[PDB]
Amino acid sequence: QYSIQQSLGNASGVAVSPINADATLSTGVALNSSLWAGIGVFARGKPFTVLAVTESNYEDVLGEPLKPSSGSQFEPIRHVYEAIQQTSGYVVRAVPDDAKFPIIMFDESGEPAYSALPYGSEIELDSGEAFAIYVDDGDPCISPTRELTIETATADSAGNERFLLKLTQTTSLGVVTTLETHTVSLAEEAKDDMGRLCYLPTALEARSKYLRAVVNEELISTAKVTNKKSLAFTGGTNGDQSKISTAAYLRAVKVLNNAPYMYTAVLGLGCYDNAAITALGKICADRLIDGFFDVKPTLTYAEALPAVEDTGLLGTDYVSCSVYHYPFSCKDKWTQSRVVFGLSGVAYAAKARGVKKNSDVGGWHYSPAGEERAVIARASIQPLYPEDTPDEEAMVKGRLNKVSVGTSGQMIIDDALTCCTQDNYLHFQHVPSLMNAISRFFVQLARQMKHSPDGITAAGLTKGMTKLLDRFVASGALVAPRDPDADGTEPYVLKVTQAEFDKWEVVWACCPTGVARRIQGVPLLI
Amino acid sequence: LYPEDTPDEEAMVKGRLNKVSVGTSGQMIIDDALTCCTQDNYLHFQHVPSLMNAISRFFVQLARQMKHSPDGITAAGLTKGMTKLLDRFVASGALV
């Protein structure tokens, strides 16, 4: 046929305007997905990077669980295991300065040499070294050891010689498995069988998870690789992970702050550094993200209260943050021995269970402390301080959540409170979750409506906000106000004020539902 | 070609990419259809632009014939033709 023009001119031809649709605009936000983020010390992982762990592949990413014999190192992995039973998450690994990774350098002839370098430092190539290969994963080549083999290959039209690199893993007993196989060429312009580019640094950065390579530009032209079998990486050791400086924790927190991925909750994976907890609370307040924190279980009942005040969270600046204390002990599943845990992740599990009760709205109504939401399933619990009882009123004043014995003999979280000094309905965790969800949805929807003529954007904002509020009311989030004489029966009241010519204000008022914490009954005779 | 690796569904939806999956009978299948539209204004779907383009093409072809006509007659012609086309589409189930 022929082209169809648009916005016809002054005569003759006809035109069809582009399709116009604006009342159909909508914003797609899950509002039900819950994800957790945290930092910790793990046996295997890439230092100071955000790593995504799921229910299936978390063990491979984080490596083998740490032995309980070592001090203050088994907590993060087991907290991650407890918290990951519901949803996936993001972790940041912290490493001491003493740790290092191995590097294998190749000469012009092909004679290999071995060295070890710290994680932060960048490698340097001296004269006579064609290139170097190091491990990006950071797992030390102890116990299961990684070995590299080189084989020759055929050319491709242009005569660019290529070779096969094979990385294998060998256990202590002698079991050998093939991990990776790749075809790489020293020539800058090389092609694979399927047409993929064949350059060792580019190929490793594109389709490899373990190895990276750096090639000295001086010796790229004159370099030859011969047949070498079973090249083993030299000794790479991990420093004492029991002692971690505050600077490393701060750097890990800063790295976690700048993460493109979206996470719904922030968890303290066995971190007892006050500065790190304050930074995590600042991140939670900045991102309007719920946060859970744990006081050191080693402290007694009397010493628990000053510990909360020691952390810079007791104030009105951090509202969504919550704290817990758990001084009991249990038994590890992997190793049959006594262990002490921190009550972090169980609260996240309760929150996830409460969220999953609804599909579209999100189901953020339920507090993370209930008869069925929180159960704390563990092998066996032995109290560490018998013949001693806590003070409930002191804990309420200090904003601490305690534990009790359930009807079926299972330990249970009997209260949910946040780190808010005032009693202005904010110490409860039920309301900030709803408010944060509403604010996030409003920000996401308003970001799309930027730079619009007046009137159209008013209708769009009103329609979207009314739909969201109606959905929340239908889900049961909002209840009629407790004062019907002074306040209208409408659960929510929304108003839009243009005010300034370019600025524009929106106000919404909601009545959160009630939480049954104390029940009192009296008998009367008639 | 890349085992032990999984894609991110949400990232693909944000980037307007159509992925593939495994069907019930063991056959690979295209599980989504999206277009290169940044906004979510019902245009990222491929179902609507096809209908709109067909309607526009038919309207252009029919209006090309009715050029240079006295008023009234051309109004009746355009109204009758467009009503017939829209009734046909409604009967076919295009519009709800």
Add this chain to the structure above:
Amino acid sequence: DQSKISTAAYLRAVKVLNNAPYMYTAVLGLGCYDNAAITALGKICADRLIDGFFDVKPTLTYAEALPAVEDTGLLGTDYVSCSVYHYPFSCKDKWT
């Protein structure tokens, strides 16, 4: 050598295809991975109100697929009917 084709030849072929008396309903990218050619094909699709299908290079991995779509000049509201797909798997040729 047909392996290496300059962008000018692709642009000339696209321009020749634009001026075709015959009518076609869809535009397909037959294994063309030149960004300029894909943008020109999308422009033709938008101009003729013709549905278009395009394919990202299968050689890229899952992570690298997303930047490739943004590299092509199709992520916008100007091209609505255009669609893109990714398929990194392999098969066997019937002839060989």
